[PDB]
Each structure stands twice: as C-alpha cells, then as structure tokens.
Coordinates of C-alpha atoms and ligand atoms in Angstrom, one line a residue:
Chain A
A2 CA -130.1 -44.2 -3.8
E3 CA -131.3 -44.1 -7.5
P4 CA -128.9 -45.2 -10.3
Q5 CA -126.4 -42.4 -11.3
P6 CA -124.9 -41.5 -14.8
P7 CA -121.3 -42.8 -15.3
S8 CA -119.4 -41.1 -12.5
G9 CA -116.0 -40.3 -14.1
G10 CA -113.0 -39.7 -11.7
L11 CA -113.5 -39.1 -8.0
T12 CA -113.6 -35.3 -7.3
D13 CA -110.9 -34.0 -4.9
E14 CA -113.7 -33.7 -2.2
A15 CA -114.9 -37.3 -2.8
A16 CA -111.3 -38.7 -2.6
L17 CA -110.5 -36.6 0.6
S18 CA -113.7 -37.9 2.2
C19 CA -112.4 -41.5 1.7
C20 CA -109.2 -40.6 3.7
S21 CA -108.9 -40.9 7.6
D22 CA -106.1 -39.4 9.7
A23 CA -103.3 -41.8 10.7
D24 CA -104.2 -43.8 13.9
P25 CA -101.3 -43.4 16.5
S26 CA -100.8 -47.2 16.3
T27 CA -99.4 -46.6 12.7
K28 CA -97.2 -43.6 13.5
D29 CA -93.8 -45.6 13.1
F30 CA -95.0 -47.7 10.0
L31 CA -92.8 -47.2 6.9
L32 CA -93.0 -48.4 3.3
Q33 CA -90.0 -50.6 3.4
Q34 CA -89.9 -52.7 0.2
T35 CA -91.2 -53.6 -3.2
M36 CA -90.6 -57.3 -4.2
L37 CA -90.1 -58.4 -7.9
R38 CA -89.2 -62.0 -9.0
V39 CA -86.0 -62.1 -11.2
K40 CA -85.0 -64.9 -13.6
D41 CA -81.2 -64.2 -13.4
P42 CA -79.8 -62.3 -10.4
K43 CA -76.4 -61.7 -12.2
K44 CA -78.1 -59.6 -14.9
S45 CA -80.5 -58.0 -12.3
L46 CA -77.7 -57.1 -9.9
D47 CA -75.6 -55.6 -12.8
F48 CA -78.6 -53.6 -14.1
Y49 CA -79.7 -52.2 -10.6
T50 CA -76.1 -51.4 -9.3
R51 CA -74.2 -50.3 -12.5
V52 CA -77.0 -48.8 -14.6
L53 CA -79.3 -47.3 -11.9
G54 CA -76.7 -46.8 -9.1
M55 CA -78.4 -48.8 -6.3
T56 CA -76.4 -50.6 -3.6
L57 CA -76.8 -54.3 -2.6
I58 CA -77.5 -53.9 1.2
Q59 CA -78.4 -57.6 2.1
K60 CA -78.4 -61.0 0.4
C61 CA -80.4 -63.9 2.1
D62 CA -80.1 -67.6 1.0
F63 CA -82.7 -70.4 1.8
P64 CA -80.8 -73.6 0.9
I65 CA -83.6 -76.0 1.7
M66 CA -86.5 -74.0 -0.1
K67 CA -83.9 -73.0 -2.9
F68 CA -84.4 -69.2 -3.3
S69 CA -82.4 -66.1 -2.6
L70 CA -83.5 -62.5 -1.6
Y71 CA -81.5 -59.5 -2.7
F72 CA -82.2 -56.1 -1.1
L73 CA -81.2 -53.0 -3.2
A74 CA -81.4 -49.4 -2.1
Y75 CA -79.9 -45.9 -2.6
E76 CA -77.7 -46.1 0.5
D77 CA -74.0 -45.3 1.0
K78 CA -72.2 -48.7 1.4
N79 CA -70.2 -47.1 4.3
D80 CA -73.4 -47.2 6.4
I81 CA -73.8 -51.0 6.0
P82 CA -73.1 -52.6 9.5
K83 CA -70.3 -55.3 9.6
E84 CA -72.1 -57.5 12.2
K85 CA -74.7 -59.8 10.4
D86 CA -77.5 -59.3 12.9
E87 CA -77.1 -55.5 12.9
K88 CA -76.8 -55.6 9.1
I89 CA -80.2 -57.4 8.5
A90 CA -82.0 -55.0 11.1
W91 CA -80.5 -51.9 9.3
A92 CA -81.2 -53.2 5.8
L93 CA -84.8 -54.1 6.6
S94 CA -85.5 -50.8 8.3
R95 CA -84.4 -48.8 5.2
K96 CA -87.3 -47.0 3.4
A97 CA -87.7 -47.5 -0.4
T98 CA -85.8 -50.9 -0.8
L99 CA -86.2 -53.2 -3.8
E100 CA -86.4 -56.9 -3.0
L101 CA -85.4 -59.3 -5.8
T102 CA -86.5 -62.9 -5.4
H103 CA -84.4 -65.5 -7.2
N104 CA -86.1 -69.0 -7.4
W105 CA -82.9 -71.1 -8.0
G106 CA -82.9 -72.7 -11.5
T107 CA -85.0 -70.0 -13.4
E108 CA -81.8 -68.8 -15.1
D109 CA -81.3 -72.3 -16.6
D110 CA -85.0 -72.6 -17.9
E111 CA -85.3 -71.3 -21.5
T112 CA -89.1 -71.4 -21.4
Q113 CA -89.4 -69.4 -18.1
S114 CA -89.9 -65.7 -17.8
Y115 CA -91.8 -63.4 -15.3
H116 CA -94.8 -61.2 -16.2
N117 CA -94.3 -57.3 -15.8
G118 CA -98.1 -56.7 -15.2
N119 CA -98.4 -54.2 -18.2
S120 CA -100.3 -56.7 -20.5
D121 CA -103.2 -59.1 -19.7
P122 CA -103.5 -59.9 -16.8
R123 CA -102.6 -56.4 -15.5
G124 CA -101.9 -55.3 -11.9
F125 CA -98.4 -54.0 -10.9
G126 CA -97.2 -51.4 -13.4
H127 CA -93.8 -49.9 -12.5
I128 CA -91.3 -48.7 -10.0
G129 CA -90.1 -45.0 -10.5
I130 CA -86.8 -43.3 -9.9
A131 CA -86.7 -39.5 -9.3
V132 CA -83.6 -38.0 -11.2
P133 CA -82.3 -34.4 -11.4
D134 CA -82.4 -34.5 -15.3
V135 CA -84.4 -37.1 -17.3
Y136 CA -82.8 -36.3 -20.7
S137 CA -79.1 -36.8 -19.5
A138 CA -80.1 -39.9 -17.4
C139 CA -81.8 -41.4 -20.6
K140 CA -78.8 -40.5 -22.9
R141 CA -76.6 -42.5 -20.5
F142 CA -79.2 -45.4 -20.4
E143 CA -79.1 -45.4 -24.3
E144 CA -75.3 -45.6 -24.3
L145 CA -75.4 -48.6 -21.9
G146 CA -77.9 -50.5 -24.2
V147 CA -81.0 -50.1 -21.9
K148 CA -84.3 -51.1 -23.6
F149 CA -86.9 -48.3 -23.6
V150 CA -90.7 -48.5 -23.3
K151 CA -91.0 -44.7 -23.7
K152 CA -88.2 -42.2 -24.6
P153 CA -88.6 -38.9 -22.8
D154 CA -89.8 -36.9 -25.9
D155 CA -91.9 -39.8 -27.4
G156 CA -95.7 -39.9 -26.6
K157 CA -97.9 -37.1 -25.3
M158 CA -96.2 -36.5 -21.9
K159 CA -92.7 -34.9 -22.6
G160 CA -89.9 -35.0 -19.9
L161 CA -90.9 -38.5 -18.6
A162 CA -89.4 -41.9 -19.7
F163 CA -89.9 -45.6 -19.0
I164 CA -87.1 -48.1 -19.3
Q165 CA -87.1 -51.9 -18.6
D166 CA -84.9 -54.1 -16.4
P167 CA -83.5 -57.5 -17.6
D168 CA -86.9 -59.1 -16.6
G169 CA -88.9 -56.5 -18.6
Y170 CA -90.3 -54.7 -15.5
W171 CA -91.1 -51.0 -16.3
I172 CA -89.1 -48.3 -14.5
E173 CA -90.4 -44.7 -14.8
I174 CA -87.6 -42.0 -15.0
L175 CA -89.1 -38.7 -13.7
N176 CA -88.0 -35.2 -12.6
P177 CA -90.2 -34.1 -9.7
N178 CA -89.8 -30.4 -10.7
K179 CA -91.2 -31.1 -14.3
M180 CA -94.4 -33.1 -13.1
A181 CA -96.3 -29.8 -12.3
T182 CA -95.9 -28.7 -16.0
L183 CA -97.4 -32.1 -17.1
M184 CA -100.8 -31.2 -15.4
Chain B
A2 CA -67.2 -73.5 -20.0
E3 CA -68.1 -77.2 -19.2
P4 CA -71.7 -78.0 -18.2
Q5 CA -72.5 -77.5 -14.4
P6 CA -74.7 -79.4 -11.9
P7 CA -78.1 -77.6 -11.1
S8 CA -77.4 -74.0 -9.8
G9 CA -77.5 -73.4 -6.0
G10 CA -78.0 -69.6 -6.6
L11 CA -75.1 -67.2 -6.1
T12 CA -72.4 -67.3 -3.4
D13 CA -71.8 -63.9 -1.5
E14 CA -68.6 -63.3 -3.5
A15 CA -70.3 -64.2 -6.9
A16 CA -73.2 -61.7 -6.1
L17 CA -70.7 -59.0 -4.9
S18 CA -68.7 -59.5 -8.2
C19 CA -71.9 -58.6 -10.2
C20 CA -72.2 -55.2 -8.3
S21 CA -70.5 -52.0 -9.5
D22 CA -70.1 -48.9 -7.2
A23 CA -72.6 -46.0 -8.0
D24 CA -71.5 -43.8 -10.9
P25 CA -71.6 -40.1 -9.8
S26 CA -74.2 -39.5 -12.5
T27 CA -76.7 -41.5 -10.3
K28 CA -75.7 -40.0 -6.9
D29 CA -79.1 -38.1 -6.4
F30 CA -81.4 -40.9 -7.9
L31 CA -84.0 -42.1 -5.5
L32 CA -86.6 -45.0 -5.5
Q33 CA -89.7 -42.7 -5.6
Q34 CA -92.7 -44.9 -6.3
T35 CA -94.3 -48.3 -6.8
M36 CA -97.5 -48.2 -9.0
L37 CA -100.4 -50.6 -8.5
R38 CA -103.7 -50.5 -10.5
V39 CA -106.8 -50.3 -8.3
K40 CA -110.4 -51.3 -9.3
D41 CA -112.1 -48.9 -6.7
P42 CA -110.2 -45.9 -5.3
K43 CA -112.8 -45.3 -2.5
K44 CA -112.0 -48.7 -0.9
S45 CA -108.2 -48.4 -1.7
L46 CA -108.0 -44.9 -0.2
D47 CA -109.9 -46.0 3.0
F48 CA -107.6 -49.1 3.3
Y49 CA -104.2 -47.3 2.8
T50 CA -105.2 -44.2 4.9
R51 CA -107.4 -45.6 7.8
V52 CA -106.0 -49.2 8.1
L53 CA -102.3 -48.7 7.2
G54 CA -102.0 -45.0 8.2
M55 CA -100.6 -43.6 5.0
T56 CA -101.3 -40.0 3.9
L57 CA -102.7 -39.0 0.5
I58 CA -100.1 -36.5 -0.7
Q59 CA -101.3 -35.9 -4.3
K60 CA -104.2 -36.7 -6.6
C61 CA -103.9 -36.2 -10.4
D62 CA -106.9 -36.4 -12.9
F63 CA -106.6 -36.8 -16.7
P64 CA -110.2 -36.1 -17.8
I65 CA -109.6 -36.8 -21.6
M66 CA -107.7 -40.2 -21.1
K67 CA -110.1 -41.0 -18.2
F68 CA -107.7 -42.1 -15.3
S69 CA -106.6 -40.8 -11.9
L70 CA -103.3 -41.2 -10.0
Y71 CA -103.3 -41.3 -6.2
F72 CA -99.9 -40.8 -4.3
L73 CA -99.8 -42.3 -0.8
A74 CA -96.8 -42.0 1.6
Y75 CA -95.9 -42.1 5.4
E76 CA -95.5 -38.3 5.7
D77 CA -96.7 -35.8 8.4
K78 CA -99.6 -33.9 6.6
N79 CA -98.2 -30.7 8.2
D80 CA -95.2 -31.1 5.7
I81 CA -97.5 -31.1 2.6
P82 CA -97.0 -27.7 0.9
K83 CA -100.2 -25.6 0.5
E84 CA -99.3 -24.2 -3.0
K85 CA -100.2 -26.7 -5.8
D86 CA -96.9 -26.5 -7.8
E87 CA -94.7 -26.8 -4.7
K88 CA -97.0 -29.6 -3.5
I89 CA -96.6 -31.8 -6.7
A90 CA -92.7 -31.2 -6.7
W91 CA -92.6 -32.2 -2.9
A92 CA -95.0 -35.2 -3.3
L93 CA -93.0 -36.7 -6.4
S94 CA -89.6 -36.2 -4.6
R95 CA -90.7 -38.2 -1.5
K96 CA -89.0 -41.7 -1.2
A97 CA -91.2 -44.8 -0.8
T98 CA -94.5 -43.5 -2.2
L99 CA -97.3 -45.8 -3.5
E100 CA -99.0 -44.7 -6.7
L101 CA -102.5 -46.1 -7.3
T102 CA -103.9 -45.9 -10.9
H103 CA -107.7 -45.8 -11.3
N104 CA -108.8 -46.5 -14.9
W105 CA -112.3 -44.8 -14.7
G106 CA -115.2 -47.4 -14.9
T107 CA -113.4 -50.5 -13.4
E108 CA -115.4 -50.1 -10.2
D109 CA -118.6 -50.6 -12.4
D110 CA -117.4 -53.9 -14.2
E111 CA -118.3 -57.0 -12.1
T112 CA -116.1 -59.3 -14.3
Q113 CA -113.0 -57.0 -14.0
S114 CA -110.2 -57.5 -11.3
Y115 CA -106.5 -56.9 -11.3
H116 CA -103.9 -59.7 -10.9
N117 CA -101.7 -59.6 -7.7
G118 CA -98.7 -61.5 -9.4
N119 CA -98.6 -64.3 -6.9
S120 CA -100.3 -66.9 -9.1
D121 CA -99.6 -67.7 -12.9
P122 CA -98.4 -65.6 -14.4
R123 CA -96.1 -64.5 -11.5
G124 CA -93.9 -61.3 -11.4
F125 CA -94.4 -58.6 -8.7
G126 CA -95.1 -60.2 -5.3
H127 CA -95.7 -57.6 -2.7
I128 CA -95.0 -54.2 -0.9
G129 CA -93.8 -54.4 2.7
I130 CA -94.5 -52.2 5.7
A131 CA -91.9 -52.2 8.6
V132 CA -93.8 -52.0 12.0
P133 CA -92.5 -51.9 15.6
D134 CA -94.7 -54.9 16.6
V135 CA -96.1 -57.4 14.0
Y136 CA -98.5 -59.1 16.5
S137 CA -100.2 -55.9 17.8
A138 CA -100.4 -54.5 14.2
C139 CA -102.1 -57.8 13.0
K140 CA -104.5 -57.9 16.1
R141 CA -105.7 -54.4 15.0
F142 CA -105.9 -55.6 11.3
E143 CA -108.1 -58.6 12.4
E144 CA -110.5 -56.2 14.3
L145 CA -110.7 -54.0 11.2
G146 CA -111.7 -57.0 9.0
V147 CA -108.5 -57.1 7.0
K148 CA -108.1 -60.3 4.9
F149 CA -104.8 -62.3 5.7
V150 CA -102.6 -64.3 3.3
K151 CA -100.4 -65.3 6.3
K152 CA -101.1 -64.7 10.0
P153 CA -97.8 -64.1 11.9
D154 CA -97.7 -67.5 13.6
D155 CA -98.9 -69.6 10.6
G156 CA -96.4 -71.2 8.2
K157 CA -92.6 -71.9 8.8
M158 CA -91.4 -68.3 9.3
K159 CA -93.1 -67.0 12.6
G160 CA -93.1 -63.3 13.4
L161 CA -93.9 -62.3 9.8
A162 CA -97.4 -61.6 8.2
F163 CA -99.0 -61.0 4.8
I164 CA -102.3 -59.1 4.5
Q165 CA -104.1 -58.1 1.2
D166 CA -105.5 -54.8 0.1
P167 CA -109.0 -54.4 -1.5
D168 CA -107.5 -55.5 -4.9
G169 CA -105.9 -58.6 -3.3
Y170 CA -102.3 -57.2 -3.6
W171 CA -100.0 -58.8 -0.9
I172 CA -98.6 -56.6 1.8
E173 CA -95.8 -58.0 4.0
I174 CA -96.0 -56.9 7.7
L175 CA -92.4 -57.2 9.2
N176 CA -90.4 -56.1 12.2
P177 CA -86.8 -55.4 11.0
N178 CA -85.4 -56.5 14.5
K179 CA -87.0 -60.0 14.1
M180 CA -85.8 -60.7 10.5
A181 CA -82.2 -61.5 11.8
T182 CA -83.7 -64.4 14.0
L183 CA -85.5 -65.8 10.9
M184 CA -82.2 -66.4 9.0
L185 CA -80.8 -68.8 11.8
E186 CA -84.2 -70.6 11.9
Ligands
LIG1 C1 -96.3 -46.0 -20.7 O1 -96.4 -44.6 -21.0 C2 -96.8 -43.7 -20.1 C3 -96.6 -42.3 -20.3 C4 -96.9 -41.4 -19.4 C5 -97.4 -41.8 -18.1 C6 -97.8 -40.8 -17.1 C7 -97.4 -40.8 -15.8 C8 -96.8 -42.0 -15.1 C9 -97.8 -42.9 -14.4 O2 -99.0 -42.9 -14.8 O3 -97.5 -43.4 -13.4 C10 -97.6 -39.6 -15.0 N1 -97.4 -39.6 -13.7 C11 -97.6 -38.4 -13.1 C12 -97.5 -38.0 -11.8 C13 -97.8 -36.8 -11.4 C14 -98.3 -35.8 -12.3 C15 -98.4 -36.1 -13.6 C16 -98.1 -37.4 -14.0 S1 -98.2 -38.1 -15.6 C17 -97.6 -43.2 -17.9 C18 -97.3 -44.1 -18.8
LIG2 C1 -96.4 -66.0 1.6 O1 -95.7 -66.6 2.7 C2 -94.4 -66.2 2.9 C3 -93.8 -66.5 4.1 C4 -92.5 -66.1 4.4 C5 -91.8 -65.4 3.5 C6 -90.4 -64.9 3.8 C7 -89.9 -63.6 3.6 C8 -90.7 -62.6 2.8 C9 -90.2 -62.4 1.4 O2 -89.9 -63.4 0.7 O3 -90.1 -61.3 0.9 C10 -88.7 -63.3 4.2 N1 -88.1 -62.1 3.9 C11 -86.9 -61.9 4.6 C12 -86.1 -60.8 4.5 C13 -85.0 -60.8 5.3 C14 -84.6 -61.9 6.1 C15 -85.4 -63.0 6.2 C16 -86.6 -63.0 5.4 S1 -87.8 -64.3 5.3 C17 -92.4 -65.0 2.3 C18 -93.7 -65.5 2.0
LIG3 ZN1 -95.7 -43.6 -12.1
LIG4 ZN1 -90.6 -59.3 1.4

C-alpha cells in the first residue's frame, strides 16, 4: 500500500468492517462494573446515594490488604438478598454497577488525591447517567451544591451536562431523546 | 472529636449511615455509559466485538471538532432500530454501554498512548465482564492472543482474571457465583 493523505474519522462502512458477530461462547457475557478509586467513602457514598439516587448493593472488606469495595447500582433495595452468599452473587451479576475502591488511609492523607483522566495523562473520561429531564436534574444538583464541569446550556452542545463527584470524576447527565438533535 | 488511631475503613453500619434512600426525582436515572479514549478504533472495535462479543449500537462523527464516538453494548443486533433517530434514542437509553472516544490522528502518532489509571497517577481502574465460566473464557482469550494482567490461577484470588484491551485498559473477567467463595478465602 502507498502512503495515504490524513484519513479523518473511520467511515460507517470502515467501522462496520472492523466488527464481527458475537461468538456463541460470549452470548451470556454482561458489562457488570466500572471501578473508580475514592479518597473518602463517606463523601462518595453520600454523593452516589443521596445526590444521584444509587443503592449500595454490596460492601466487601479486606482487613489484611486494608481496602474496601463498594458496589452501587440503580436497584430496588427490596431485591437485595438477605443471605450473604446469595447477596454477593446477585450484586455481582447486576449490569451497570459502579465499584468504588477505598484504599484505607487515603481519607487521612492531605497530599493524596486521585486523577479523573481528563487532563494529562488522559484515558478514562466519564460515567454517564440517562435522566428524563437534564434541566430539572441539574437545577436539583445546583441546589445540593454539586460542582459542574459543564452546565446544560453552556458550551456548543445544549441539553447535555457534566458534574463531578467528590473525587472530581466527570459524570455526563444526558437525555437519550435529545441526543438525536445534537447530531 | 479527639484524634483516632489509623482508620480501618468503614463498618457496615457506618457505611449504611452514609446512604440515603433514592429521592423520587432520581427514580428513572440509569447508569448508561463508561467512556474510554482509544488510540485506534479499528483495533478497539475488533477487540470489543470479536473477542468480547459486544455489539456496535451507534457511531457518531463530529467532522469539524475531528473526533468519533463508538457505543458498544451486549445487545441482540435484532433489537437495534432501523430508523436513525429511534436508533440513537434506543442506543443512549441502554444500560451498561461502553463509549469509545477516537480523537482523529492518535493512530498516526507513535509517541501517543492513553493512561489506564493503574499506575501513577491512579484513578479509574477497570471495567468488568461477568461470564458463566472464567477458565473457558480465558482459554479462548489466550488462543486469540489477548494480553493478560492476571491469569485466573495467578495471584492470591483464584477464579478471577484481568485482561487488557488494545489501549492497555484493564478488564476484569469474573463469575458472580464464585465471588462469594473469594470473601471467606
Ligand atoms: C466536556 O464537555 C463536553 C461537552 C459535550 C460532549 C459531547 C458528548 C459527550 C461525550 O463525548 O461523551 C456527546 N455524546 C454524544 C452521544 C451521542 C450523540 C451525540 C453526542 S455529543 C462531551 C464533552
Ligand atoms: C490486579 O489484580 C487483582 C486481583 C484481585 C482483585 C480483586 C477483586 C477485583 C476488584 O478489586 O475489583 C475483587 N473484587 C471482588 C468483588 C466482590 C467480592 C470479592 C472480590 S475480590 C483485584 C485486582
Ligand atoms: Zn459520554
Ligand atoms: Zn472489579
């Protein structure tokens, strides 16, 4: 192949040609969790449960290695099994869970903070919550003192916001029905 | 409050006391997406579709700003609407989607790579796929040339693996039914 001018995006045809159908060995795979490290689980738990309305579905403590895992999800607390074995199997088979990792001590270290991936070095950008109404969700967020990266009507793309959690991780607030207009 | 010995993390009742019930204004909120930046969408699309079995449910191009968004999910392709507007609304209301961001040109810069958050500076660690059988999933991964951070029987916690995607992002491979046994161990 001879050298080509700067490509640009992939075309739809190009992207589609890079995609294979799902092998039957993957048919039961599910995207179960996204893991973020948190400095202070008290502030993180208050933010994800009170501000965003998630439920704590599982807490795991590792006394020797000195860390805790918190699993948050949009689940009715009435569906949490009472028996601890059944609870962990149910929690870790939920789609779309958020795993917070607390390395014991980070809440007592004034020089410690995690990196949100949205400045050098970049990688992870954000989690995103679909909401029925971005403007009313963001008005409530304002009233609860939530720090904003992008208010819904600031920047080029109207109807879409970014807030941050107590560690500074970016959270997109989007309305699926308004994303078509943004194209 | 008097000074305390080094914190042993939260007790169950401490953690529970930091949790509020869900305000009715949040009742229809859902955890829709996790966004990772990818150097090369050809490699990333091949990895997430062929190796992990995800479906590309939406591609978005921004020709002036020069980036593309790829939405991947575990969805039956027969459920993807045919009409573009319905398709985007359906795609972006799916739970548990992966959004890959391609900043045009990164695939042509030999000194460029993204950071996976698992060395300084740390933050994000991983996504995780629940599978029926970690050992058979990982045997297949080996045969497809997938790079491993943790083989299922290496390290202290057996029955759990970590692979990496073409950018070096960590992906946990777990069996929900085997995570209970890991607590007692
Ligand atoms: C930090 O400021 C912004 C403002 C807008 C965006 C645009 C986004 C979010 C993203 O890149 O993840 C858009 N997402 C979609 C999804 C579908 C269709 C259009 C858009 S624009 C991103 C960052
Ligand atoms: C990179 O090596 C490892 C090895 C084991 C682990 C343990 C994990 C994964 C994680 O921290 O997310 C465990 N997760 C759970 C979840 C529920 C119950 C037990 C465990 S051990 C993590 C990284
Ligand atoms: Zn996004
Ligand atoms: Zn994990």
